[PDB]
Design a protein around this ligand. Structure first.
Ligand SMILES: *[C@@H]1O[C@H](CO[C@@H]2O[C@@H](C)[C@@H](O)[C@@H](O)[C@@H]2O)[C@@H](O[C@@H]2O[C@H](CO)[C@@H](O[C@@H]3O[C@H](CO[C@H]4O[C@H](CO)[C@@H](O)[C@H](O)[C@@H]4O[C@@H]4O[C@H](CO)[C@@H](O)[C@H](O)[C@H]4NC(C)=O)[C@@H](O)[C@H](O[C@H]4O[C@H](CO)[C@@H](O)[C@H](O)[C@@H]4O[C@@H]4O[C@H](CO)[C@@H](O)[C@H](O)[C@H]4NC(C)=O)[C@@H]3O)[C@H](O)[C@H]2NC(C)=O)[C@H](O)[C@H]1NC(C)=O
Ligand SMILES: *[C@@H]1O[C@H](CO)[C@@H](O[C@@H]2O[C@H](CO)[C@@H](O[C@@H]3O[C@H](CO[C@H]4O[C@H](CO)[C@@H](O)[C@H](O)[C@@H]4O[C@@H]4O[C@H](CO)[C@@H](O)[C@H](O)[C@H]4NC(C)=O)[C@@H](O)[C@H](O[C@H]4O[C@H](CO)[C@@H](O)[C@H](O)[C@@H]4O)[C@@H]3O)[C@H](O)[C@H]2NC(C)=O)[C@H](O)[C@H]1NC(C)=O
Lengths: 212, 212
C-alpha cells in the first residue's frame, strides 16, 4: 500500500524573505492497478488550493512516486501554522493524513562563542576553530564559516543536542590543515567568522569573529 | 506481521572486561492471535546456546514486545565477529534474520583537547567547559567528566559526526552555572577532566585536564 512522507522547509528558507520556503508531500509505492492520487492541503485545518503537484513518476521497482509542493509564507511558518497533506488513492482503506509545523515552544536566542585551538593541537596535522552555539529554541538553525568575506568550506557541524534546560546547543568545527593557505591566514592573525541564522536573532543573523 | 530490530553493545561495555557487553534482538508488532516467538542465535554462523529470552511487555497499542539478550565476549566483538538473530512466528511468511557486527576498518586513536569558556560567556547564566574529541574510528566511544576523582554529571555530549577524512569527532560540554559550588571550584582553579574510552587508546582510556 502507498506511504506518505511530509518534509518541512529548510531552516535558511524561512528566515530570509528572499528565499522560498516549501513543505513537500511525497507519496511512494503507488501501484499500477490504482495509479490515481489526489492531494488535499490544509493550513491550520483550512483547505488551501495553491500547491503545485507534479505528474507521477514511475520508479525502477515498477511503483509510482508522486510529489506535491506547497509554498509557505515565512511568517506563517514562524507563527506556528500547521500544514496538513491528505493523500487519497483507491488502493487505500482510507486517506492518509500527515501534518508538520515548527516545534512548539517559546523561541530562545542562541548565544554564540568562538574558541581557538588548544595549544596542544598545533602538534597534529591540523587545528580546529570551534563555534559553540547554545541556548536556542526551536532546533532549526543554520551555521556557516567565512574569512575575509568569503566562505570557508572545510567545516562540519554537529546536530543540535537537547540540553538539560530544554534548549538546544551544537558545535561547529572549521578545520585548518597544517599546510594550507587557511593555516597561513590563521597564523597571520586573519579573522575567521562563525555565522548563525535563527529566528530568535535580530535580523535572524549574527556573526562572531575569531583570530589568533 | 511483526518486525525485528537488532542492537550492538554499549561502547563502554566492550572496553572493560569487568563489564558485560550484550547484543539485543527486539521484536515489535507481535499480536495476541499469534503470540509465540522463537529465537536462534549464531556467531559467525555458529549456533550458540547461551542466549536468554526476557518475558514480554504488552504495549499501549495492544501489541506485544519480545526480546532476547545475548552476552558477548569483549574480544569477539572487537575482532569483528558477526552476530545473527533469527525470529520465528506463525504470522510471518518466513523467519526474519538480522545480523550485526562492529564497523570495519583500522581503528584510529582519539585526540582529546579541552577548551575553556570564552571570556564572553562569563556574562551569561553559565559557562561551558568544552572537550573536543577528534580523529577516532570506529565511532563507538564513551565520554565522561570528573573533578577531584568524583564524577561531574551536568554534561551533554554530541553524537559522533563523520569528518571529511572518514574519522569521527564529537564535542562534550560540561555546564558550570553562574552561581554554584562547581563555579566556585572553577573560579578557584580546581582541575576538571574529560575522560574518553575508545578501543584505540592504550588501556582503552585517556583523560585530559582543564583548569582556570
Ligand atoms: C520503490 O522505489 C522508491 C525509490 O525511488 C528510487 O527508485 C528505486 C527503484 C531505487 O533506485 C531507490 O534507490 C530510488 O531512491 C522507494 O521510495 C522510498 O521509500 C522509502 C520508504 O520505503 C522512503 O524512505 C523515507 O525516507 C525519508 C527521507 O527521505 C529523504 O531523504 C532520502 C535520502 O535519505 C531521499 O532519497 C528522499 O528523496 C527524501 O526526500 C528529500 O530529502 C531531501 C534531503 O536529502 C530534502 O532536502 C528534500 O526536501 C526531500 N525531497 C523533497 C522532494 O522534498 C525518511 O525521512 C523516512 O524515515 C521516516 O520514516 C521511517 C518509516 O518509513 C521511520 O523509520 C523513520 O524513523 C522516519 O520516521 C520518523 O518517525 C516519524 C514517522 O514515522 C516522524 O514523526 C519523524 O519525524 C520521522 N523522522 C525522524 C528523524 O524521527 C523514510 O526512510 C524514501 O524516501 C523513498 N524514496 C524516494 C526517492 O522517495 C520505494 O520504497 C520503493 N518501493 C519498494 C517496494 O521497493
Ligand atoms: C506499538 O508501540 C511500539 C512502541 O511505541 C512500537 O514499537 C516500535 O516500532 C518502531 C517501528 O516499527 C521501531 O522503530 C525502529 O527503531 C529502531 C531503533 O529502536 C531503538 O531506539 C528506539 C528509539 O528510542 C527505542 O524505542 C528502541 O527500544 C531501540 O533501542 C533500545 O533502547 C536503547 C536506545 O537506543 C538501546 O541502547 C537499547 O540497546 C535498545 N533496547 C534493547 C533492549 O536492546 C530503528 O533502528 C529502526 O530503524 C529501522 O527502520 C528505519 C526506517 O526509516 C531505517 O532507517 C533503519 O535502517 C532500520 O531499518 C526503527 O526505526 C521501534 O523500535 C519500536 N519500539 C520498541 C520499543 O521496540 C510498535 O510499532 C507499535 N505498533 C504499531 C502497530 O505501530
Amino acid at each position: 500500500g502507498p506511504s506518505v512522507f511530509l518534509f518541512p522547509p529548510k531552516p535558511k528558507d524561512t528566515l530570509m524573505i528572499s528565499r522560498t520556503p516549501e513543505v513537500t508531500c511525497v507519496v511512494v509505492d503507488v501501484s499500477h492497478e490504482d495509479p490515481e492520487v489526489k492531494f488535499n492541503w490544509y493550513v491550520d485545518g483550512v483547505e488551501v488550493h495553491n500547491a503545485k503537484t507534479k505528474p507521477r513518476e514511475e520508479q525502477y521497482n515498477s511503483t509510482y512516486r508522486v510529489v506535491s509542493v506547497l509554498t509557505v509564507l515565512h511568517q506563517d511558518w514562524l507563527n506556528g501554522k500547521e500544514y496538513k497533506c491528505k493523500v487519497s488513492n483507491k488502493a487505500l482503506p482510507a486517506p492518509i493524513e500527515k501534518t508538520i509545523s515548527k516545534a512548539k515552544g517559546q523561541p530562545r536566542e542562541p548565544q554564540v562563542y568562538t574558541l581557538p585551538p588548544s595549544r596542544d593541537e598545533y602538534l597534529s596535522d591540523s587545528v580546529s576553530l570551534t563555534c559553540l552555539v547554545k541556548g536556542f529554541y526551536p532546533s532549526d538553525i543554520a551555521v556557516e564559516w567565512e574569512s575575509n568575506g568569503q566562505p570557508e568550506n572545510n567545516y562540519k557541524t554537529t546536530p543540535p543536542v537537547l540540553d538539560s534546560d530544554g534548549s538546544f546547543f551544537l558545535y561547529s568545527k572549521l578545520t585548518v590543515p597544517r599546510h594550507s593557505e587557511t593555516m597561513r591566514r590563521w597564523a597571520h592573525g586573519n579573522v575567521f567568522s562563525c555565522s548563525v541564522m535563527h529566528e530568535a536573532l535580530h535580523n535572524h543573523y549574527t556573526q562572531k569573529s575569531l583570530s589568533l
